[PDB]
Design a protein around this motif. Sequence first.
Motif, PDB file in Angstrom:
ATOM      1  N   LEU B   2      19.482 109.627  28.018  1.00 47.69           N
ATOM      2  CA  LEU B   2      19.445 108.179  28.084  1.00 47.69           C
ATOM      3  C   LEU B   2      18.029 107.695  28.362  1.00 47.69           C
ATOM      4  CD1 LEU B   2      21.814 105.833  29.693  1.00 47.69           C
ATOM      5  CD2 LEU B   2      19.407 105.605  30.072  1.00 47.69           C
ATOM      6  N   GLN B   3      17.609 106.678  27.634  1.00 51.86           N
ATOM      7  CA  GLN B   3      16.279 106.140  27.786  1.00 51.86           C
ATOM      8  C   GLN B   3      16.334 104.707  28.317  1.00 51.86           C
ATOM      9  OE1 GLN B   3      16.658 108.417  25.100  1.00 51.86           O
ATOM     10  NE2 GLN B   3      15.199 109.787  26.167  1.00 51.86           N
ATOM     11  N   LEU B   4      15.432 104.467  29.350  1.00 52.99           N
ATOM     12  CA  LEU B   4      15.308 103.152  29.997  1.00 52.99           C
ATOM     13  C   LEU B   4      13.896 102.683  29.757  1.00 52.99           C
ATOM     14  CD1 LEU B   4      16.877 102.928  33.566  1.00 52.99           C
ATOM     15  CD2 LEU B   4      17.617 101.808  31.516  1.00 52.99           C
ATOM     16  N   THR B   5      13.750 101.627  28.979  1.00 49.28           N
ATOM     17  CA  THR B   5      12.428 101.118  28.652  1.00 49.28           C
ATOM     18  C   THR B   5      12.130  99.805  29.363  1.00 49.28           C
ATOM     19  OG1 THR B   5      12.847 102.058  26.486  1.00 49.28           O
ATOM     20  CG2 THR B   5      10.959 100.607  26.648  1.00 49.28           C
ATOM     21  N   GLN B   6      11.087  99.732  30.198  1.00 46.78           N
ATOM     22  CA  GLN B   6      10.772  98.450  30.878  1.00 46.78           C
ATOM     23  C   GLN B   6       9.789  97.639  30.083  1.00 46.78           C
ATOM     24  OE1 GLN B   6       9.916  98.493  35.327  1.00 46.78           O
ATOM     25  NE2 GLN B   6      11.157 100.380  35.228  1.00 46.78           N
ATOM     26  N   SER B   7       9.848  96.312  30.157  1.00 41.88           N
ATOM     27  CA  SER B   7       8.852  95.486  29.485  1.00 41.88           C
ATOM     28  C   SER B   7       8.556  94.321  30.390  1.00 41.88           C
ATOM     29  CB  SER B   7       9.353  94.912  28.183  1.00 41.88           C
ATOM     30  OG  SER B   7       9.666  95.921  27.266  1.00 41.88           O
ATOM     31  N   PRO B   8       7.257  93.933  30.516  1.00 39.45           N
ATOM     32  CA  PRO B   8       6.161  94.623  29.830  1.00 39.45           C
ATOM     33  C   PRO B   8       5.801  95.750  30.761  1.00 39.45           C
ATOM     34  CG  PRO B   8       5.233  92.945  31.171  1.00 39.45           C
ATOM     35  CD  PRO B   8       6.762  92.690  31.136  1.00 39.45           C
ATOM     36  N   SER B   9       4.963  96.678  30.303  1.00 40.55           N
ATOM     37  CA  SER B   9       4.575  97.745  31.192  1.00 40.55           C
ATOM     38  C   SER B   9       3.634  97.189  32.287  1.00 40.55           C
ATOM     39  CB  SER B   9       3.930  98.864  30.367  1.00 40.55           C
ATOM     40  OG  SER B   9       2.825  98.371  29.620  1.00 40.55           O
ATOM     41  N   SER B  10       2.850  96.175  31.951  1.00 44.60           N
ATOM     42  CA  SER B  10       1.909  95.575  32.895  1.00 44.60           C
ATOM     43  C   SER B  10       1.984  94.056  32.719  1.00 44.60           C
ATOM     44  CB  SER B  10       0.467  96.065  32.602  1.00 44.60           C
ATOM     45  OG  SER B  10      -0.432  95.442  33.506  1.00 44.60           O
ATOM     46  N   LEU B  11       1.726  93.295  33.773  1.00 44.15           N
ATOM     47  CA  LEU B  11       1.880  91.854  33.670  1.00 44.15           C
ATOM     48  C   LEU B  11       0.976  91.205  34.653  1.00 44.15           C
ATOM     49  CD1 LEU B  11       5.419  90.253  34.086  1.00 44.15           C
ATOM     50  CD2 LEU B  11       3.413  89.363  35.356  1.00 44.15           C
ATOM     51  N   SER B  12       0.257  90.165  34.241  1.00 45.81           N
ATOM     52  CA  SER B  12      -0.636  89.469  35.204  1.00 45.81           C
ATOM     53  C   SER B  12      -0.005  88.137  35.611  1.00 45.81           C
ATOM     54  CB  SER B  12      -2.055  89.233  34.620  1.00 45.81           C
ATOM     55  OG  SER B  12      -2.022  88.780  33.280  1.00 45.81           O
ATOM     56  N   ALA B  13      -0.238  87.709  36.840  1.00 45.99           N
ATOM     57  CA  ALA B  13       0.381  86.484  37.303  1.00 45.99           C
ATOM     58  C   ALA B  13      -0.319  85.950  38.522  1.00 45.99           C
ATOM     59  CB  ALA B  13       1.850  86.747  37.633  1.00 45.99           C
ATOM     60  N   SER B  14       0.039  84.740  38.936  1.00 47.72           N
ATOM     61  CA  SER B  14      -0.578  84.172  40.116  1.00 47.72           C
ATOM     62  C   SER B  14       0.504  83.774  41.100  1.00 47.72           C
ATOM     63  CB  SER B  14      -1.439  82.937  39.740  1.00 47.72           C
ATOM     64  OG  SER B  14      -2.238  83.205  38.581  1.00 47.72           O
ATOM     65  N   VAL B  15       0.135  83.628  42.362  1.00 55.41           N
ATOM     66  CA  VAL B  15       1.052  83.226  43.405  1.00 55.41           C
ATOM     67  C   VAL B  15       1.714  81.907  42.942  1.00 55.41           C
ATOM     68  CG1 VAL B  15       1.238  82.422  45.768  1.00 55.41           C
ATOM     69  CG2 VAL B  15      -0.333  84.363  45.229  1.00 55.41           C
ATOM     70  N   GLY B  16       3.028  81.827  43.085  1.00 55.95           N
ATOM     71  CA  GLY B  16       3.753  80.662  42.646  1.00 55.95           C
ATOM     72  C   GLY B  16       4.321  80.838  41.256  1.00 55.95           C
ATOM     73  N   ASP B  17       3.881  81.810  40.470  1.00 56.06           N
ATOM     74  CA  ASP B  17       4.506  81.894  39.153  1.00 56.06           C
ATOM     75  C   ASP B  17       5.958  82.432  39.174  1.00 56.06           C
ATOM     76  OD1 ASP B  17       1.858  81.358  38.456  1.00 56.06           O
ATOM     77  OD2 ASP B  17       1.653  83.220  37.266  1.00 56.06           O
ATOM     78  N   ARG B  18       6.632  82.273  38.039  1.00 55.34           N
ATOM     79  CA  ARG B  18       7.957  82.779  37.846  1.00 55.34           C
ATOM     80  C   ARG B  18       7.748  83.900  36.879  1.00 55.34           C
ATOM     81  NH1 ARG B  18      10.842  79.335  38.322  1.00 55.34           N
ATOM     82  NH2 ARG B  18      12.942  79.549  39.246  1.00 55.34           N
ATOM     83  N   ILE B  19       8.181  85.110  37.199  1.00 54.50           N
ATOM     84  CA  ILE B  19       8.021  86.182  36.244  1.00 54.50           C
ATOM     85  C   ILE B  19       9.353  86.835  35.981  1.00 54.50           C
ATOM     86  CG2 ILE B  19       5.618  86.689  37.007  1.00 54.50           C
ATOM     87  CD1 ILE B  19       6.780  89.201  38.292  1.00 54.50           C
ATOM     88  N   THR B  20       9.476  87.491  34.842  1.00 48.61           N
ATOM     89  CA  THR B  20      10.715  88.141  34.608  1.00 48.61           C
ATOM     90  C   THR B  20      10.323  89.424  33.940  1.00 48.61           C
ATOM     91  OG1 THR B  20      11.078  87.334  32.395  1.00 48.61           O
ATOM     92  CG2 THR B  20      11.736  85.872  34.155  1.00 48.61           C
ATOM     93  N   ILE B  21      10.948  90.511  34.405  1.00 55.31           N
ATOM     94  CA  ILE B  21      10.701  91.863  33.937  1.00 55.31           C
ATOM     95  C   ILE B  21      12.006  92.273  33.275  1.00 55.31           C
ATOM     96  CG2 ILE B  21      10.261  94.263  34.783  1.00 55.31           C
ATOM     97  CD1 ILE B  21       8.726  93.095  37.078  1.00 55.31           C
ATOM     98  N   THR B  22      11.948  92.971  32.165  1.00 53.69           N
ATOM     99  CA  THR B  22      13.202  93.358  31.554  1.00 53.69           C
ATOM    100  C   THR B  22      13.337  94.882  31.379  1.00 53.69           C
ATOM    101  OG1 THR B  22      13.633  93.506  29.202  1.00 53.69           O
ATOM    102  CG2 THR B  22      12.346  91.607  29.936  1.00 53.69           C
ATOM    103  N   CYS B  23      14.562  95.393  31.336  1.00 51.76           N
ATOM    104  CA  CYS B  23      14.785  96.825  31.225  1.00 51.76           C
ATOM    105  C   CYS B  23      15.918  97.024  30.226  1.00 51.76           C
ATOM    106  CB  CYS B  23      15.107  97.349  32.641  1.00 51.76           C
ATOM    107  SG  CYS B  23      15.714  99.059  32.935  1.00 51.76           S
ATOM    108  N   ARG B  24      15.695  97.849  29.225  1.00 54.12           N
ATOM    109  CA  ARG B  24      16.679  98.077  28.169  1.00 54.12           C
ATOM    110  C   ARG B  24      17.082  99.538  28.141  1.00 54.12           C
ATOM    111  NH1 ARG B  24      15.244 101.611  23.320  1.00 54.12           N
ATOM    112  NH2 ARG B  24      17.032 101.437  21.872  1.00 54.12           N
ATOM    113  N   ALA B  25      18.381  99.789  28.039  1.00 55.49           N
ATOM    114  CA  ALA B  25      18.870 101.152  28.017  1.00 55.49           C
ATOM    115  C   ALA B  25      19.282 101.574  26.611  1.00 55.49           C
ATOM    116  CB  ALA B  25      20.076 101.312  29.045  1.00 55.49           C
ATOM    117  N   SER B  26      19.096 102.850  26.286  1.00 56.30           N
ATOM    118  CA  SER B  26      19.453 103.344  24.947  1.00 56.30           C
ATOM    119  C   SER B  26      20.950 103.385  24.654  1.00 56.30           C
ATOM    120  CB  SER B  26      18.856 104.722  24.690  1.00 56.30           C
ATOM    121  OG  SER B  26      19.242 105.630  25.690  1.00 56.30           O
ATOM    122  N   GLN B  27      21.777 103.451  25.699  1.00 54.81           N
ATOM    123  CA  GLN B  27      23.251 103.454  25.607  1.00 54.81           C
ATOM    124  C   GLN B  27      23.675 102.548  26.772  1.00 54.81           C
ATOM    125  OE1 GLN B  27      24.536 107.767  26.091  1.00 54.81           O
ATOM    126  NE2 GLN B  27      22.340 108.140  25.654  1.00 54.81           N
ATOM    127  N   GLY B  28      24.859 101.956  26.692  1.00 55.98           N
ATOM    128  CA  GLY B  28      25.314 101.052  27.751  1.00 55.98           C
ATOM    129  C   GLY B  28      25.518 101.730  29.092  1.00 55.98           C
TER     130      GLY B  28
END
Lengths: 7, 214, 224
Positions: B2-28
Amino acid sequence: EADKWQS
Amino acid sequence: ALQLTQSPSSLSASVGDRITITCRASQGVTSALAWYRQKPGSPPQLLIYDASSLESGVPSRFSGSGSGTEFTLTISTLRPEDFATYYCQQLHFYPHTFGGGTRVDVRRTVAAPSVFIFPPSDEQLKSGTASVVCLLNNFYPREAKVQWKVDNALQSGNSQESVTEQDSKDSTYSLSSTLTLSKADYEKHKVYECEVTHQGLSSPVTKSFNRGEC
Amino acid sequence: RITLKESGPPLVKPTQTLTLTCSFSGFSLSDFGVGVGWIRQPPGKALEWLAIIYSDDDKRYSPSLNTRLTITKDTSKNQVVLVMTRVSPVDTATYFCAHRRGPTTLFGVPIARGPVNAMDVWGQGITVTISSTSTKGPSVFPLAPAAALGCLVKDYFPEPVTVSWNSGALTSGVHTFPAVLQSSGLYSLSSVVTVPSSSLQTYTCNVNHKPSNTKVDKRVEPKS
């Protein structure tokens, strides 16, 4: 395989 | 497996921002997914368990949603302690996989690296080894690519590099790369070149020297 | 309050056997459905799952490491042991043990399995280095040409080494990089400093490797 807490 | 891929691998942001990280699996993986935040030098800390449940004692700005093959972690108002690396973990199938991680760092304006190439010292040469070091100083974002070339031959498998942690008052990174060769091989070539690719450079920059030129 | 802590040797040689112990408090490995797992993290890399053991004694291992791992528990001592055989340099990593909750029960009846989906409490982690090297002091070489210069602290073991510039007076523009473990089993690091192309003022790196009693001050200048 299936984790302990599956089903 | 099973493969778990995160996106993005790196992310820049500032205090106060809203960020969202995602993770996708090869099978449910149903809802058996957990998110963690890991600060440098510390163990990972549980934020969200079972895809969306908030772990006790974890601040409410953290939120997790999704099930099956796609999950997301969102931090609604980024705080200074959130500059860190986040990981997702699947617990539906053995082995209990982790994603590759996503680094969240302080955003700042793009800055190209100042590049410098250092030939090996005569003192090292007398011991029979030759280290050629390349320095990429104060750049941003973190991703940079260094390619060593000797008399135009692309080098591979004979260099190592390390990167400093984000500077607390620059927000830039620096990178050191060492090319290592025996004194003998060193002596069999002239042009030692460090080629650098980076977002802040409108094309690759090369710094080099001719061995023995005096 | 649940706490876990890893213990074992910080250094191990290739082909040898590594035994790591996780001692914990706040729960018992006899509690219903509880688990204790092991996860490792090579420097600068991602987390990698290794194995887990539950209170009913079911054991599971990473398929990639199955042949070299044994996990066992000692319920009465509140410890979980992970034994890894035939280690090699790629096994250098920080090793963490962690708690996994069992299903919530109501009057001893399992009613919620959502809490098992995470490793909820982690130990601080124990750093393990795999190298056949013996203690050894660094060779220090000059790195000579904002202008840049530095010192290459080469071939030493084990970590750490300390580097400062001008006995501690030079700090701005200094970057001391994390050491890399060479295929030889010895570490190597560079420390550089950037200055106005005019300052070329004197520059001396002070290097100290406590492990081998090796102090070196190396003044670096613009050759020629």
